[PDB]
Amino acid sequence: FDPAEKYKMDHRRRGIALIFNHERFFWHLTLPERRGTCADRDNLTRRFSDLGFEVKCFNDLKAEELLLKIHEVSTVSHADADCFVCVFLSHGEGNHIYAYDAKIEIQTLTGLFKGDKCHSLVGKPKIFIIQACRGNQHDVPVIP
Amino acid sequence: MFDPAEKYKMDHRRRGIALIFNHERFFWHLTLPERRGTCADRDNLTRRFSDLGFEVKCFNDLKAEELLLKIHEVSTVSHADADCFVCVFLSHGEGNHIYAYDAKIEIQTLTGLFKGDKCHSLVGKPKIFIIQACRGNQHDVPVIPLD
Amino acid sequence: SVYTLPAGADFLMCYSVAEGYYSHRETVNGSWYIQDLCEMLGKYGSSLEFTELLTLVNRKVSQRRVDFCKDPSAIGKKQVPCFASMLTKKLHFFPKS
Amino acid sequence: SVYTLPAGADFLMCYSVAEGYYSHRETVNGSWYIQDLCEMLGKYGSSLEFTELLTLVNRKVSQRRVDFCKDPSAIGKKQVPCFASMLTKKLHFFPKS
Ligand SMILES: *CCS(=O)(=O)N1C[C@H](C(=O)Nc2ccc(OC(F)(F)F)cc2)C[C@@H](c2ccccc2)C1
Ligand SMILES: *CCS(=O)(=O)N1C[C@H](C(=O)Nc2ccc(OC(F)(F)F)cc2)C[C@@H](c2ccccc2)C1
């Protein structure tokens, strides 16, 4: 048992970084525009590209499109990849992330990459990054 | 200047308190299974945290009132000469709730006592919560790497 | 030092299992999670970074399977723990002077 | 290995904020979290352990305050991010050959 054990990261490819970037939402959701998200998308694209990731960006996908695209990436072989990265830049509600038109259960999205659904990522890191509010409380400042 | 190797200050007079709430049995009308072997967990955590310099305070099968009094008390004593605070729950849970002997408590009510605006002497210091409890009704399934 | 802290900063929540899952135990020797946590605390508590140690706990618990259980559908089932860090620095428990 | 893995193992969930809180942004330059994440990825992505880097992200975001906002009760408010690790090993992004 080696306390210093590292994930094997000497595969042919680093792997895919999926970025779902949501700037505007279906009018009847009454969700504010996410001005500055495109800077975040571009910034994450440069940074993950420099770490060897194949960065795949999708802007303002509706629920059907987002679910098709992420299912697709879950079903391609990651056998020659180090890891998988998935970024959501959007609004959230409880355990849900918003697409353009509707919210999706985050567990439906991570569930596609669990060992029983995605054999080629078994033993490999699955990293989810979520820029979204997780409620309606501002945290308050304090001093040493 | 930004030091990536920066550590929490851990050279205070005391390491600090480790609170252990150990729940083996529950009020009959909760219909919750007994947690036989939890006392081995309590004793094991007591030895290990004591060897790291913690003042270990154990409470067995407290009812909601007792647990809330005890944890409020520890939240209101000065930790100013302590490195950190540790709080262990060995019990059953439901959503964002931990079970006392007789009823469930919102976990956020318990952690909320140690937020910087409620507990000034732990501002800048680690607050570590350890929870041995089920978080639902799904078993995780075994898998093997693709060779 | 010049900056204020969020009131919710420097919390570390260490769970026996990820949200939505059952946790497991030996017959009467205690829980998988606390047993493995305590073993890692015994070997590494005083040297390793605490989250680095909780990662070792995750690997140790991930190696276990349910051998005996009254619910036969639990047999051969698995567990990974989960820690949620709002820590802002490295956390060590070096021996105190 | 001799051992099987739980199907939920080797997940790392990196959140801009802890459950129940609002996340924040500069006027048009992007979110606090992604800006600080990207800065730390630029400086440290290729050397530091990833959760070690996410801890630096937590410290950088913790230093920010809301200076201007349409909701005046948000002014001076704070944010700590939160990462939830089900990882079993050290994670590095060393440059690939
Ligand atoms: C001063 C308040 S705010 O920042 O306008 N806003 C906080 C919160 C929100 O939506 N924040 C947010 C953070 C990061 C984002 O990504 C980015 F685009 F890259 F910047 C986008 C948005 C909640 C907002 C709100 C407004 C009205 C009603 C409820 C909540 C306010
Ligand atoms: C064979 C399944 S079980 O372990 O008997 N059990 C799983 C779960 C549970 O209560 N787990 C558990 C884990 C660690 C514990 O700490 C310890 F006591 F120190 F060991 C205690 C308990 C749910 C159980 C259950 C039983 C009846 C109905 C619903 C759920 C079964």
Residue numbers in the entry:
A (entry chain C): 31 to 174
B (entry chain A): 30 to 176
C (entry chain B), D (entry chain D): 196 to 292
The authors write:
Caspases are cysteine-dependent aspartyl-specific proteases involved in a range of cellular and disease processes, ranging from apoptosis to inflammation and neurodegeneration. Caspase family members are broadly classified as inflammatory (C1, C4, and C5) or apoptotic caspases. While often classified as an executioner caspase, the function of caspase-6 (C6) in physiology and disease has remained enigmatic, and it has been suggested that C6 may act upstream of the other executioner caspases. C6 possesses a non-catalytic cysteine (C264) not present in other family members and is situated on a loop in the small subunit at the distal end of the active site. The catalytic cysteine (C163) is found on the large subunit, while two additional cysteine residues appear to be buried and thus inaccessible for disulfide formation.
When tested in a biochemical assay, enantiomer 3a potently inhibited C6 activity with an IC50 value of 8 nM, while its enantiomer 3b exhibited an IC50 at least 100-fold weaker. A complex X-ray crystal structure of 3a showed similarities and differences as compared to the binding of 2a. Both analogues engaged C264 in a covalent bond as expected, while the trifluoromethoxyaryl side chain of both analogues was buried in the S1 pocket, where the aspartic acid residue of the C6 substrate is usually bound. To accommodate this large and hydrophobic ring system in S1, arginine 220, which formed hydrogen bonds with the aspartic acid in VEID peptide-type inhibitors, is moved by 4.2 Å (ε nitrogen) to create a hydrophobic cavity complementary in shape to the sidechain of 3a. However, the location and orientation of the piperidine ring and sulfonamide function were quite different in the two analogues. The phenyl substituent present in 3a made few, if any, contacts with the protein, but by occupying an equatorial position in the bound conformation, it energetically stabilized the required axial orientation of the trifluoromethoxy benzamide side chain of 3a, as bound in the S1 pocket. The potent low-nM inhibition of C6 WT protein by 3a was completely lost with the C264A mutant, further establishing that 3a engages C264. The potency and exquisite isoform selectivity of 3a, together with the lack of C6 activity for its enantiomer 3b, strongly suggested that 3a inhibits C6 by first forming a pre-covalent complex that positioned the electrophilic vinylsulfonamide for subsequent reaction with C264. To better understand C6 inhibition by 3a, we determined kinetic parameters (kinact/Ki values) of inhibition. These data indicated that indeed, both noncovalent and covalent interactions contributed to the binding, with a Ki value of 7.0 μM, providing an estimate of the intrinsic pre-covalent binding affinity of 3a for C6. None of the remaining seven putative off-target proteins were proteases; all are membrane-associated proteins, including two heme proteins (CYB5B and HMOX2) and one cysteine-dependent enzyme (PTGES2).
